Symmetry: C7
Subunit: 237 residues, 7 copies
Amino acid sequence: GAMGMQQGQMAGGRAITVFSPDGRLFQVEYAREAVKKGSTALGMKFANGVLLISDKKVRSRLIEQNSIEKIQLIDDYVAAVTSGLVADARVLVDFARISAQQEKVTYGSLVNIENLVKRVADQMQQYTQYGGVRPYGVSLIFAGIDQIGPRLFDCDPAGTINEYKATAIGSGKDAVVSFLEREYKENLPEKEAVTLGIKALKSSLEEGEELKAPEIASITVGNKYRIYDQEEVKKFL
Amino acid sequence: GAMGMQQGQMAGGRAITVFSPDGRLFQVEYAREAVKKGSTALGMKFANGVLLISDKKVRSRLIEQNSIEKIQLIDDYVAAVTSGLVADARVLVDFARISAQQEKVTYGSLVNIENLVKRVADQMQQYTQYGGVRPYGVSLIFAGIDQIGPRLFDCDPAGTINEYKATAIGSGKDAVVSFLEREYKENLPEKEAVTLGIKALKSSLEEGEELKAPEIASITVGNKYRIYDQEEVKKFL
Amino acid sequence: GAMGMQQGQMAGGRAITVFSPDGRLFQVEYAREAVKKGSTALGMKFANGVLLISDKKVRSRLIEQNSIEKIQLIDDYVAAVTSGLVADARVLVDFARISAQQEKVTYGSLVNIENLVKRVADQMQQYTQYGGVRPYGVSLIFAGIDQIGPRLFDCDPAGTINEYKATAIGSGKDAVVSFLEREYKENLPEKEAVTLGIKALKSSLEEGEELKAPEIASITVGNKYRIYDQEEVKKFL
Amino acid sequence: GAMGMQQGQMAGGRAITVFSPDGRLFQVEYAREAVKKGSTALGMKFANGVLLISDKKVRSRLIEQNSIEKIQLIDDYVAAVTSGLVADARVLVDFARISAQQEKVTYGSLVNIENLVKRVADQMQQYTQYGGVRPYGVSLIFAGIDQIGPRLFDCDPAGTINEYKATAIGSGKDAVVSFLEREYKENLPEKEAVTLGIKALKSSLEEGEELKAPEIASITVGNKYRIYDQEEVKKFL
Amino acid sequence: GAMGMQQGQMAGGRAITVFSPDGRLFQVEYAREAVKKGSTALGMKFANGVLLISDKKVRSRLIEQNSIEKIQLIDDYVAAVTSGLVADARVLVDFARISAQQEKVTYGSLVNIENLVKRVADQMQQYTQYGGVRPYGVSLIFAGIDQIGPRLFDCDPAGTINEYKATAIGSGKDAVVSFLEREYKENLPEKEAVTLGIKALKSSLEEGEELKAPEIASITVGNKYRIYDQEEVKKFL
Amino acid sequence: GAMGMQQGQMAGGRAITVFSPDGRLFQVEYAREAVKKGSTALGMKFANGVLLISDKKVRSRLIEQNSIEKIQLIDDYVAAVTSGLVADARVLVDFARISAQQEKVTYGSLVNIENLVKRVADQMQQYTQYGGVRPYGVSLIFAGIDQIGPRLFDCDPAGTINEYKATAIGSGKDAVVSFLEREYKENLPEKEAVTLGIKALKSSLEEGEELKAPEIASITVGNKYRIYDQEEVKKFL
Amino acid sequence: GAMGMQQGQMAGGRAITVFSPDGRLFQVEYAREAVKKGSTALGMKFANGVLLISDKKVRSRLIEQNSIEKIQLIDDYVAAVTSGLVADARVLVDFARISAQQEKVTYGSLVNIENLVKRVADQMQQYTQYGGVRPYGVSLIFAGIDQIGPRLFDCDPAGTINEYKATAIGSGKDAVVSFLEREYKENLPEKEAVTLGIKALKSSLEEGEELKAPEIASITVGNKYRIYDQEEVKKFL
């Protein structure tokens, strides 16, 4: 290792690394498609915290209900929800989990969450140009409260990242996003915030009437994340 | 020890890791095909345990009967049954076996079985994107009782994993699954559960009348797995 | 039938690791072809041991007769006979050989022969999915007596393995396999076993009348393998 | 990880690395296209410093405003602004950052900024010829005051670097560059410099009337970088 | 409907490691061709040793005669001759040479010559399946006396190996092999053996009348190899 | 069939390491094209030293004049001028620089400059054959005075190196090279030498009349390099 | 988008390391072409030494005459002359130089010059089969006197080597070779040898009348190489 490269490379790889004559990475585009075909979910900053809410659409009676958690915990103060290729999504989450621990064990504290999202984004970005390897077909949004305050970030297959006041992803994005874009209330207290949200989620994917059972979680500055119990969400439902 | 692989070109070339214009991994699809053409098997949680049952369809008098065991043990408290390219299934089984052992030797106990399946799933997910290498053409289900209790999982070539109350896989999946979807009884005591199962298995693949000799095994909270003997199974047959 | 390629640069150069739209590994298929064109051989469990018998079809006077041994020992208590690409068989056999030694030197004894074959099988299966490399176009059968008793297994290019009561391989497989399928006698004593065998072998490939000189070996529980001498085989001939 | 590996054979991969019969790297060309489609930004030396300004074109009310910072600090005395594939840009920037620190910890001080940009450019140049890997689709400009005095450089996907008296990049380059090319005033005092710039920016992208909210930062010999606050910028707006 | 793009036939990839739809390695085939276009040579066991003979076909006066030795020594007790791509032949010959020394240095003696050839063969076999690398376009025959007694083997591009009573290689293989196949005399004493040989060689390649000057060497049990001198060979000519 | 060959017309390239049926490296050729489209520059040995001169064609007022140095120093007693892909030139130049230092640190002195060029030349030659990598799209000339005396060398993308009495490179190579070819005066004294040069340079590229501001430098045995100041050059201009 | 004499499908050898259906390496073939298009040179053993002679065809007056040495030394007792891709030739020569030093440093003396050439040949041969790498487009001849005596060898891109009494290489090979093939005099004393040579070289390439200035060097057993001075050769001219 005379060169002493910071990043190792198992192989150069072949395919997935061609700009179209119009300056676009088609594979990254196709990857985005798969995410469009995923479940719908959203999140939004409110009073003194941020909430995450995803549409838990279930099929057979034979499915073990809750076990199909869409909103996941990275750490007591940071959760993420994903949409797209399930396998890809999982693996990406675990990366984020350990990555979170890493900052914790070295600095002793996850001071800025933006940094956590950046690291998993970069992971994704590498597959955007490193030849022989398929891009991660998934998008996800991170939410929680860090040293700075309540934070909401999203991230696409491209490795692109932005911070929002409110946003959604998955199948009914354009829809639910418009709703918020119009009726999103800045410092909405929790109860009302979850309402506006569920209403927004509803309107969107609710071309098929029944909202079914939404999965919702919320954290407020000062303490740990709170997952809503079946009845509590059904109350807003 | 170690293989000592100084330098070799095991992986190379281009032909996979390409998302289609509609967001699909055709290779993983083609793989799924291989599993459909696999034998039929199912399982379900019951009273205070879970059972597994596979259709042991035999040909020649010259085959060594039982030696063609479809339900395989991972450890005294967890078994799995597979469907798809036989070779791929075997190697993927052994991986889970040692992987199981690993958790035992570090932590002292395989507390959560869900985790065991996740590892093997991730293994499969890797070949879903790492360029030069064909995916695992197989699906399988893990069943057993862990720290949490009786648990039932299934996994496909995509690395997708889900927990069930009852399910099937292989050739007659759609069929048998629908029967259960309809006549599945929550806390059915073992004797009746194995029955409902065998009945369900019958209907499905039984376009060809004869059920032949099914392979069935079960475990109940509090103890190790029990493989049904020829006569015992023939009793429900 | 293109999926949706538009890049002029891409149009070929596909590697070995592609499932057909129907879920098949054509390469493994074409491999099988090669083994079909191989010599014909069989083996069957009998009284208290198992035997091996292959058709040693010779051409020129100029060949060093016996030197063209088709039945090869892996160890005094276990042998294998092969068919398909000669070179690939050889190297595969030597692998089994050393592999056998390993278990002996670590555990002190090759307790279960089934395991030895599983390993060489796994070797083959690796080439079925690891990109840049050609599958082993050879099928072979191992037989001998282990701690469990007299055993017989076969292995094809896909790495598939099974245990039989009797079986064959090579060109005249279908034929000879059918003969046994019908006239195979369970605990047939050696002398008669070899008879039924040579008879079966005959019928099959004997579209060309002359059986020529078969190569036959047998081992019985309690002792080491015995290779039949020219005269002894000719006796049954 | 657990197994040791030796780095060797620099060559690897095969894809982009072909000169057209007219001696052009089409890939790098396409890359450039991507940068044309990016946001517009510029920079210019003035009285005793240099300033940067980028068009921060915002969409939804749901975006976290400022968080979409386009001008980025590399260190208190040198900033950079980018255009092209957003992910690529980010990773490149961080490289610039760690690299800047590297010089500082070895030499004790980043004496010549030209060097910094030289290293990042070489980074990009590598992807212009090393087989299997897609080029960075981005162009950025570095500005800041070094040991030599105020300095301004630009960098394109080809690895080409040049020092300007003023320049721009992104979508409206041609437009804005021309305006300056004509009315650029040599040692224009900051206040008028930023004016000449925002005007130049306006005219250009201002086919769509509304200049929206520009992002502007400036540094002067002797001290650290200063970013203009919302009101201050709005003052020149 | 149903998919039927590939009924059973598939396109052959350019890469080296593809079985044809008929179970054949075309590249290995093409290699064989190269060997047929080589010079003709043969060898045969006789009285109490073995001899080798190759047609040394010379062109210009400007060639350094003898220097074009086709019969090469691997060790005083074992020689080999080759046909096909000259370069490939040479490299292949030296490997065998060093390989022989290795056996000598570890065991203290080259006990069985069959093993030596086996090693050189496996080498070639490797290039039959390991992807990116062209097979050895050469075939050679080893001859000499070992612990067992006089021995003779041949080896082709496929790594296939056999031992003969007599055999040839190169261009006029088919012709000369037939001659011997018919007129080969078992325990023919040297003088006559070399005659039968030279006659056989003659007949074969002697469509062009002049046999020219043949290269011949012979070893007998009990001693080292003996290469015939110009005059001695001309005596049988 | 046999000796099958595709269309003679070549357009869509792929791998880089393929001789044409006529014995040429199309990629290296195409490379040359890139250099032809580069600036024009020349050099010639004179009285007791050597001088270099390049046409510094400038565009916008906004460029930082001198900073676009075309003549670059490798060490106080050796400089080089380059033409072709700017990016490839630079990286190559730096290679020569450190390469120079290397000889100094080991032998204590850069005795022979011809050697320095050979090393940078080999670097280039390497990319002419090592597969997966695009050749350096540049040519340059090295001149200065070494232990032997005043020297002048040129190097193209192929890695070809020649020593000249006078030569040129770039766009108008053929033209200027011809003027010299005819009016070159062997031991011309500096002042006149630079005159003959500028004249020669003029004629060539001067289809467009204005010579603009040339960049010139000269060194004489016994001392270090001297770069002409704006006015000085303007004097000959 | 491919190169070929247009005759049938199948690439001639673009993917390198591919035997043609008739058993030929097209890439190696194309390489030979380039050596044909190189300068013409020859050598022949004489009285008690050997001499080399190459046609030094020069163009412009601007070239540094002698500096374009075609005959190069490897060591005071062995020289070689090359033809083909100049760049490839050079690196190939340096290899043989260091390679010579190696033997001297280990054994204390270069005993057999044949070995030296063989090493440079094998190097070449490697690129004949190791996939991703263009073969060396050059041929060269080594001449000198070793422990055995005066020696002369030639070597092509294929890695084929032969020892001669006299031979040539490059463009007019066939021509000059015939001349020798007819009028070559065995133990011709130097003065006359060089004559027979220069005459031969003349006839050949001299379709263009003027032989220009030939480069000639010779060595005699017992002492070191002697390169002829401009006048001395002009004496034979």
